[PDB]
Design a protein around this ligand. Structure first.
Ligand SMILES: Nc1ncnc2c1ncn2[C@@H]1O[C@H](COP(=O)(O)OP(=O)(O)OP(=O)(O)O)[C@@H](O)[C@H]1O
Ligand SMILES: [Mg+2]
Lengths: 287, 287, 57, 94, 111, 191, 191, 30, 209, 51, 55
């Protein structure tokens, strides 16, 4: 029987492709095929993925196009990947990470051809920079769940994924389908380019800010600092005077002179120190 | 012409992935693929790419096979998937340009009237971006030599969609350091800029060594550019630039001093509040 | 597959219906702007199982 | 030929060089600026032609070598301040 | 179906459903954000409430039938003593909408 | 090494090599890995390795394990619980028991499992008078077992905890070092 | 038999010659028509591509089972420049290597009726490379029955070695359209 | 001197030393 | 990990969420918010929210499902939009009006002068009024003077009809009044103009209808 | 610092809880029940919490 | 929207009746309707190429 230790290893390219398809087709439950290989009985690499046409309305899965799938597979084999289809992925823009009736039917269709086929659900809307909402699934058998069986084998203690969400539990988790743990492959080579993202050229590194604009910015910021200094004097005065509401209900809806003054000093000091250092380094290097 | 080009993490990952695919399949030392993107105003955003079967020799500099039939099949299919991603150019994972690049650019131009090549050096680098963008342009030489097609550089940088940024941030969740501070990050940018300037100067110095010794013929355009740069180098001991530099340095140090004083007063206020809370808690415990 | 198409259509068309109106009939291919007795206005990209040219506002 | 620092030309020097008179060197310099071969300004009170740029000129092998030495000096300065900044900010520097 | 109220961040729109609630919703890509300005009818998705398409201004079924009622085929020959009244009504209705520059020349805005 | 499993192997190798020695270099390495390394499994393995290294001086472990238990990572908390259990196995350490008592009823199934198992390992072959928490933990185990609120892994922890408490007909104790002071390699391997 | 073949067609300035009715261009079009029809009538999984040998040494249509595309592309051809044929064969071999069907037997058929000004040493070197990489070639020559026929025979023999029968040559003197000879040639006879 | 004052104040700030029923209630209500 | 946790808790600000109004604050981390659905709830508020933006009646973003205060929106959410002075501005003028100089001067001193001379008002001791009511028989120039003021004024202008505040959806109309006044406050200097105020300002009210 | 971070991570979890209605008490019953008018429609009798 | 237009209201006194200073809630609602109508005809926004007939 299947084990409660199966792990779907989604590659960086696969994850990026699912997220791009997600925040390209919204709210349509856009869909694609996950290409990889069942290396063993407990692991499923998903090396790549590729989208499907998404013809017309796509609020529901669209009965994977066999001709498009075949031509994708043949050309990928021609230009690289000789890998079979290990599953299908689709998007749930803000719903969560559950499966609908159509999703369950499509995953039955996938299992019929390959018993190990996985169903990945991404949530491009709920994903944030550092945690991508995504979940792998396979369906529980009505036959076994009526004939008193757990359709997962608990050899390991790897069934602590996230205390599955109430959304999934009410949408049919642990009854008609189960969640498969997901990990990722780190190569330290793609990560170099992902780090090269946000990188600035040495032009920007050494450029000096327009001096007139810098002076105007300093003048303005010091003006707001002056006003916030007046307000800070006012606030510190009537702060110890009374603290029944000072704890939480004396700053809501009203400006905080101390906080804004801290922000202004931080920003202006950063700007001035950076520009001074840039000017000095420039005066020497470009001599 | 395209002055600015923005490559995406998906494109970089797919290029690395295609290079790995070809390396596993055989041994070519270079891989070429097609590059799809948009045409934001005078800015080429290359959003996706797909590998095409490309091969070449190492001696003739003219024996190379590129499958434009496969190219157009895959492009039409990616158009069916997503429509806005049109052919915008091609990429080849060479450490440096090649002789064939002009001919391959013509082959691409048969598809995209304004094709931009992007050399995506899969080999990790340290002091520069991984993408070098070029655009073919006729060079009308002033010395009467026949006009020939040549590659012209266009400013290339890495940018991400919202979902691409989310995915790459998730991938780099544990590598990228975010608890650095704006000032520390800007100082790091300054030192990186100095390193990049040193690298460019070293490249120019090596070229001058080669030319002086005799390996390279005199390139009059390059010499014109070099002497223009050396003449553009400023003088920082004019007794007027020095006065201006001191005046602006003091005009910035006054603001830095004001901000430091404000920060000191705020810190003293925080210390007073902390000690007041400490005494209150201790007295209440003693009560 | 007339039999199975009609089977699926009947499964979707099983009672009870919600009675609404056809307040507007737009052209985009014809679409509806129905308003339903729950006091809810829904735009239908596809009118449905009734002929488009038989519905009036 | 004059360096990048003492590139101030006097009317007498230009007149001697070009076999013209100080009353025509002024028009000659304005003509040069107009045609765009040089960039700069003229101070006729002191009769000095301040210059800041000349049309790029072909260079010989010795001139290329001298430019290479200047580039080496520039590179050494750049490396020196790279090292200085890195060492001084090593703690904060990421 | 709702109406857009304002655009926030190129992907957030404050839209109020005709039923009355107000939300901030997304927008599917090929909508030409310039086409949907404050006050335009839109079709939000029934689940994610994200905008799907901008729609023309609604015409109530009442106003539609109001416009489309058949006034028989009554002719002016079927009205008797009303001749002065007929020409005053026509003065107000027809002529200003067919030759609107005579009244401009005389310097009035027709009744 | 790249592989997180290889890094966990390094942690366990440090544990085995320096078991009982209390070598400050090994403690530094293990604790730094438990803090700063990017994989939760290896963080937990590092904390357990520290527990292995500190059993000759069971009075020292409570401090570090407390700092790591009233803590951030669920895996770090669990590793601290197992470190306490391994360290104090057969000692009935009151401080370790007090540290583990809050850990029980933690918002994590495996954290509760580990806390219960470590608690039973510590009270192995113990009685009320020696440590006045055995009855509390026994009734806790019984309630967890005959409850439906608790997660399946918490139930597993409770069953294992009862088994440990009454291990060997309640006529056996778990000591990593023999009664003569020699590290008991079978016991180290078993744990 | 699974066959992946490409037809290299020389389209030099000489292919406005009228020794074959009506002109060598139309004769070549008929020849490619009949050879591609034979390829189609063979195992349909067989696929055919087109290369043009000129100053550009270009590839018109890559491997494709369909034939109308190849016919239209070859119709949209004019004679210009000289032939290289060394590039030609090398690019053809690269196309062979980069074919979707690896099981397909590699095949190049070259209509090269023209003066081949390539040194016999490099001819034989390329022949040896092709044979050792297991690609058979069936060269077709017409027009110059003396200038290059010796070189082509030597090239085919060098490919042959001792038993490499896959390499073949067929030289046809001027006459009617280049149809009867190609039909009654050993190449299509063995199909 | 001002930066020194800020650092000294921040260093000087003394921090004095410092539910499951809700956990169960949440799990049951869900 | 603190930075990572902040970025993670950003997850609750997902796009499909319902708008509401922040009525009152109970604790530092809880507040009462009236959801636009009609009801109001006492719910927790996201920690990473600037409490300075939680002004009274401020529009906020409530989680679609949990209905917690997830974000605070710019004070420009409103159903009654300003006039696009480019085209919606009327073509009437004080020259086109003629006569009624007393009414023109009164409306000036009430609405126009204090919008550019409030400093002078405060310095001489007057308290500027808000509301002028322009009452009088029908056809005497109330709406025409309003149009002229809109045309000439260099301040924001929000026109509305008292009959437009009555909506089927209960709570809409008080929401609309709040929206118009918030828009005027954030576009100050502004002039609000309610035509036919007696459509909502009637004195006889029959609760139970 | 650890308490702060843990507070944030549990905040993300406990902000998905249903928001609580607000109702005005009109009359207090016996046996720990209170008649409350819940805004804007509905008049219930609710058991008081044991706090 | 359909700029050259006429609006015929038959028996206008159904809506355009005098406004009561002591009317019922129904009367006040109908008066709100009347005042909306008055503003639409000759309110702030001018009417162009739209004519009214009332019988
Ligand atoms: N003082 C005036 N000078 C010139 N035209 C005027 C004057 N007063 C009214 N009018 C004309 O009357 C019409 C303007 O009426 P307006 O809408 O201002 O009336 P009102 O006093 O607000 O009354 P009501 O509320 O009954 O509509 C226009 O035709 C305008 O030309
Ligand atoms: Mg009026």
């Amino acid at each position: 029987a299947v084990d409660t230790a199966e792990q779907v290893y989604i590659s960086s390219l696969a994850l990026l492709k699912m997220l791009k398809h997600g925040r390209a087709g919204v709210p349509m439950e856009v869909m694609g095929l996950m290409l990889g290989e069942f290396v063993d009985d407990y692991t499923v690499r998903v090396i790549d993925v590729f989208a499907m046409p998404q013809s017309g309305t796509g609020v529901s899965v669209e009965a994977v196009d066999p001709v498009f799938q075949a031509k994708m597979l043949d050309m990928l084999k021609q230009t690289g990947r000789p890998e079979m289809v290990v599953g299908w992925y689709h998007s749930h823009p803000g719903f969560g990470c559950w499966l609908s009736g159509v999703d369950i039917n499509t995953q039955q269709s996938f299992e019929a051809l390959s018993e190990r086929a996985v169903a990945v659900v991404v949530d491009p809307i709920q994903s944030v920079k550092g945690k991508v909402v995504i979940d792998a699934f396979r369906l529980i058998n009505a036959n076994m769940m009526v004939l008193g069986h757990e359709p997962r084998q608990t050899t390991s203690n790897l069934g602590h994924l996230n205390k599955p969400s109430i959304q999934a539990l009410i949408h049919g988790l642990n009854r008609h389908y189960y969640s498969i743990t997901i990990n990722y492959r780190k190569n330290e080579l793609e990560q170099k380019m992902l780090l090269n993202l946000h990188k600035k050229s040495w032009m920007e590194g050494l450029t000096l800010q327009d001096y007139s604009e810098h002076c105007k910015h300093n003048e303005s910021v010091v003006k707001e600092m002056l006003e916030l200094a007046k307000n800070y004097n006012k606030a510190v005065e009537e702060e110890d005077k009374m603290t029944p509401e000072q704890l939480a209900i004396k700053n809501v809806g009203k400006q905080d002179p101390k906080r804004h003054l801290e922000e202004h000093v931080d920003v202006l000091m950063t700007s001035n120190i950076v520009q001074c250092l840039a000017a000095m380094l420039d005066t020497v290097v470009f001599k | 012409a395209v002055q600015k080009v923005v490559v995406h993490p998906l494109v970089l990952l797919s290029v690395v992935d295609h290079f790995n695919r070809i390396g596993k399949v055989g041994n070519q030392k270079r891989v070429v693929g097609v590059l799809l993107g948009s045409w934001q105003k005078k800015v080429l955003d290359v959003s996706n790419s797909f590998a095409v079967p490309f091969d070449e020799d190492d001696k003739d500099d003219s024996v190379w096979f590129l499958d434009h039939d496969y190219l157009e099949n895959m492009y039409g299919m990616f158009k069916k998937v997503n429509a806005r991603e049109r052919i915008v150019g091609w990429y080849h994972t060479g450490p440096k340009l090649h002789k064939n690049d002009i001919a391959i650019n013509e082959l691409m131009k048969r598809y995209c009237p304004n094709s931009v090549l992007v050399i995506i050096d899969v080999k990790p680098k340290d002091l520069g971006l991984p993408t070098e963008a070029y655009i073919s342009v006729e060079e009308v030489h002033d010395d009467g030599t026949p006009t020939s097609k040549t590659f012209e550089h266009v400013t290339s940088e890495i940018g991400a969609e919202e979902a691409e940024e989310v995915g790459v941030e998730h991938l780099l969740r544990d590598i990228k350091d975010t608890t650095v501070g704006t000032l520390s990050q800007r100082i790091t940018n300054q030192v990186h800029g100095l390193k990049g300037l040193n690298s460019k100067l070293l490249d120019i110095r090596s070229y001058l060594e080669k030319v002086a010794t005799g390996k390279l013929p005199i390139n009059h355009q390059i010499i014109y550019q070099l002497q223009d740069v050396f003449n553009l180098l400023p003088d920082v001991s004019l007794q007027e630039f020095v006065k201006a530099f001191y005046l602006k340095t003091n005009d910035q140090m006054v603001v830095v001093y004001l901000a430091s004083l404000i920060r000191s007063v705020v810190a003293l206020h925080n210390l007073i509040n902390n000690k007041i809370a400490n005494r209150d808690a201790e007295k209440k415990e003693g009560q | 597959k007339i039999k199975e198409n009609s089977e699926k259509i009947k499964v979707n068309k099983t009672l009870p219906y919600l009675v609404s109106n056809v307040i507007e009939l737009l052209d985009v291919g014809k679409c509806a702007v129905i308003k339903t007795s729950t006091r809810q206005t829904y735009f239908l990209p596809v009118i449905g199982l009734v002929d488009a040219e038989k519905l009036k506002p | 030929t004059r360096p990048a620092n003492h590139r101030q030309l006097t009317f007498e020097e230009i007149a001697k060089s070009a076999k013209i008179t100080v009353n025509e060197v002024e028009l000659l310099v304005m003509k040069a600026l107009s045609v765009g071969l040089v960039k700069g300004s003229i101070d006729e009170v002191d009769k000095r032609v301040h210059m800041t740029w000349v049309q790029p000129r072909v260079l010989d092998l010795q001139q290329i070598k001298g430019m290479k030495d200047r580039l080496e000096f520039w590179c050494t300065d750049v490396k020196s301040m790279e090292m200085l900044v890195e060492h001084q900010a090593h703690d904060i520097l990421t | 179906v709702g109406e857009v109220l304002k655009q926030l961040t190129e992907e957030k729109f404050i839209v109020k459903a005709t039923n009355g609630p107000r939300y901030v919703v997304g927008c599917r890509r090929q909508l030409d954000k310039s086409k949907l300005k404050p006050g335009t009818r839109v079709a939000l998705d029934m689940t994610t409430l994200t905008i799907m398409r901008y729609l023309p201004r609604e015409v109530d079924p009442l106003v539609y039938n109001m416009s489309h009622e058949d006034p028989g085929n009554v002719s002016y020959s079927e009205i008797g003593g009303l001749s002065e009244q007929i020409r005053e009504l026509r003065e107000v209705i027809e002529l200003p909408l067919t030759n609107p520059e005579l009244f401009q020349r005389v310097g009035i805005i027709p009744p | 090494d790249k592989d997180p499993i290889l890094r966990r192997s390094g942690m366990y190798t440090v544990a085995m090599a320096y078991c009982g020695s209390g070598n400050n270099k090994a403690i530094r390495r293990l604790l730094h890995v438990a803090v700063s390394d990017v994989n939760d499994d290896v963080r937990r393995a590092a904390v357990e390795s520290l527990g292995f290294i500190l059993f000759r001086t069971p009075e020292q472990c409570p401090s570090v394990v407390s700092l790591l238990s009233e803590s951030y990572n669920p895996h770090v908390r669990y590793g601290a619980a197992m470190a306490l259990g391994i360290c104090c196995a057969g000692t009935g350490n009151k401080e370790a028991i007090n540290l583990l008592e809050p850990m029980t009823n933690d918002p994590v199934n495996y954290v509760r499992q580990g806390a219960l198992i470590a608690s039973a390992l510590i009270m192995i072959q113990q009685t009320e008078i020696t440590c006045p928490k055995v009855n509390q933990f026994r009734q806790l185990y019984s309630k967890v077992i005959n409850d439906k609120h608790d997660d399946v892994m918490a139930k597993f922890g409770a069953i294992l905890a009862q088994g440990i408490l009454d291990a060997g007909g309640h006529n056996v104790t778990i000591s990593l070092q023999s009664r003569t002071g020699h590290t008991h390699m079978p016991s180290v391997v078993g744990v | 038999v699974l066959e992946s073949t490409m037809v290299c067609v020389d389209n030099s300035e000489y292919m406005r010659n009228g020794d074959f009715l009506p002109t060598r261009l139309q004769a070549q079009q008929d020849a490619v028509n009949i050879v591609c029809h034979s390829k189609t009538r063979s195992n349909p999984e067989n696929n055919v591509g087109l290369i043009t040998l000129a100053n550009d040494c270009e590839v018109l249509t890559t491997l494709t089972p369909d034939t109308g595309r190849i016919l239209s592309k070859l119709h949209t051809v004019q004679p210009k420049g000289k032939i290289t044929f060394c590039t030609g064969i090398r690019v053809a071999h690269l196309a062979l290597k980069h074919r979707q069907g690896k099981n397909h037997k590699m095949r190049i058929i070259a209509f090269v009726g023209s003066p081949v000004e390539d040194n016999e040493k490099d001819l034989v070197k390329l022949a040896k490379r092709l044979k050792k990489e297991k690609v058979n070639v069936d060269i077709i020559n017409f027009g110059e029955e003396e200038v290059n026929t010796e070189k082509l025979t030597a090239f085919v023999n060098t490919l042959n070695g001792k038993d490499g029968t896959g390499s073949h040559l067929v030289t046809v003197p001027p006459g009617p359209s280049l149809a009867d000879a190609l039909i009654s040639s050993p190449i299509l006879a063995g199909e | 001197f001002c930066l020194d004052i800020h650092n000294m104040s921040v260093k000087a700030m003394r921090f004095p030393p410092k539910s499951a029923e809700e956990r169960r209630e949440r799990e049951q209500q869900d | 990990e603190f930075l990572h946790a902040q970025e993670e808790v950003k997850r609750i600000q997902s796009i499909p969420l319902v708008i509401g109004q922040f009525l009152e604050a109970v604790d530092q981390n809880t507040a009462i918010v009236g959801s636009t659905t009609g009801s109001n709830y006492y719910v927790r508020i996201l920690s990473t929210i600037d409490r300075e933006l939680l002004k009274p009646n401020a529009s906020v973003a409530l989680h679609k499902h949990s209905n917690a205060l997830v974000d605070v929106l710019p004070p420009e959410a409103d159903s009654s939009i300003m006039m696009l002075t480019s085209d919606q501005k009327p073509d009437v003028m004080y020259a086109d009006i003629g006569g009624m100089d007393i009414q023109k001067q009164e409306v000036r001193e009430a609405v126009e002068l204090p919008l550019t001379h409030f400093e002078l008002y405060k310095q001489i001791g007057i308290d500027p009024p808000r509301g002028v009511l322009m009452y009088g028989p029908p056809g005497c120039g109330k709406t025409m003077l309003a149009k002229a003021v809109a045309h000439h004024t260099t301040a924001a202008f929000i026109r509305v009809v008292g009959s437009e505040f009555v909506q089927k959806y209960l709570g809409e109309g008080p929401r609309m009044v709040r929206d118009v006044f918030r828009l005027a406050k954030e576009n100050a200097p502004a002039i609000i103009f309610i035509d036919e105020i007696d459509a909502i300002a009637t004195k006889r009210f029959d609760a139970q209808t | 610092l650890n308490a702060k971070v843990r507070l944030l991570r549990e905040e993300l979890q406990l902000l998905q809880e249903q928001g609580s209605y607000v109702g005005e008490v009109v009359r207090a019953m016996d046996k720990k029940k209170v008649l409350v008018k819940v805004h804007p429609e509905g008049k219930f009798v609710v058991d008081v919490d044991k706090n | 929207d359909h700029q050259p237009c006429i609006i015929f209201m038959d028996e206008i006194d159904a809506i355009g009746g005098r406004r009561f200073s002591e009317g019922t809630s129904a009367d006040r609602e109908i008066q709100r309707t009347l005042m909306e109508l008055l503003n639409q005809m000759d309110g702030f926004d001018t009417l162009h190429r739209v004519k009214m007939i009332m019988a």
